[PDB]
Amino acid sequence: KVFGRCELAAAMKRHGLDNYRGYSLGNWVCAAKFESNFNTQATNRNTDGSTDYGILQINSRWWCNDGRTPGSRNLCNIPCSALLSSDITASVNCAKKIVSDGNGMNAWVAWRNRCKGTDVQAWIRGCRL
Ligand SMILES: CC(=O)N[C@@H]1[C@@H](O)[C@H](O[C@@H]2O[C@H](CO)[C@@H](O[C@@H]3O[C@H](CO)[C@@H](O[C@@H]4O[C@H](CO)[C@@H](O)[C@H](O)[C@H]4NC(C)=O)[C@H](O)[C@H]3NC(C)=O)[C@H](O)[C@H]2NC(C)=O)[C@@H](CO)O[C@H]1O
């Protein structure tokens, strides 16, 4: 699909992301334009061999099943292809706890620099929520 700015962010407040688990609601909407550029069909493999999956930019190496990742943990226990479709209604149970493991957003790379030390509080702005 193709989400407009105000139209692909209000979905986090329908999934318990507003002020969830130590991160504020706004801290989130920013990286989205920084991970797949508001699109769920944007994916790539890596120089390390782990294939990424969706707007979320996840690797088949530590989190899901693509089967081409042997010794892959897959603690999520759901097909990697289970997130990329237009419907993402079940797509966050993993990204939800990916931070509870104690290292936070560190899994995400772009935010640590692209959204870190920024006016992240300035992306979620301009939309009613
Ligand atoms: C734009 C782009 O291309 N970015 C891609 C990333 O989105 C993508 O994701 C990140 O992949 C890296 C590896 O390439 C991954 O790094 C490690 O992740 C694990 C598990 O989540 C972390 O877990 C820690 O484990 C240690 C023991 O190993 C524990 O003691 C600690 O308590 C754990 N803490 C956490 C975070 O739970 C590691 O900490 C982390 N590496 C380091 C240096 O600590 C990220 O987690 C990935 N994040 C996401 C969102 O998937 C990557 C994969 O293909 O590709 C990038 O290109």
Swiss-Prot record:
Keywords: Allergen, Antimicrobial, Bacteriolytic enzyme, Disulfide bond, Glycosidase, Hydrolase, Secreted, Signal. SUPFAM superfamilies: Lysozyme-like (SSF53955). Disulfide bonds join 6-127, 30-115, 64-80, 76-94. Transmembrane segments: none annotated. The gene is LYZ. This is Lysozyme C. In the egg white and polymorphonuclear leukocytes. It comes from Gallus gallus (Chicken). GO terms for cellular component: cytoplasm; endoplasmic reticulum; extracellular space. The active site is at 35, 52. The lineage of its organism: Eukaryota, Metazoa, Chordata, Craniata, Vertebrata. Residues 1-129 form the C-type lysozyme domain. One of its GO terms (molecular function) is identical protein binding. It catalyses: Hydrolysis of (1->4)-beta-linkages between N-acetylmuramic acid and N-acetyl-D-glucosamine residues in a peptidoglycan and between N-acetyl-D-glucosamine residues in chitodextrins.
